[PDB]
Design a protein around this ligand. Structure first.
Ligand SMILES: [Zn+2]
Length: 46
């Protein structure tokens, strides 16, 4: 007695970070990089 769910992501490979899709996983894995990094911890003072 409830709406049944179905379908995870027909797409080949999507970026759970932004949502970009890449036919080839390799393209995605490498892309995800654009996200990681550039995460400083406040001021440096050095
Ligand atoms: Zn992304």
């Amino acid at each position: 007695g409830s709406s049944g769910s179905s379908g995870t992501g027909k797409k080949p490979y999507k970026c759970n970070e932004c949502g970009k899709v890449f036919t080839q996983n390799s393209h995605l894995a490498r892309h995800r990089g654009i996200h990681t990094g550039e995460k400083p911890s406040g001021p440096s003072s050095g």
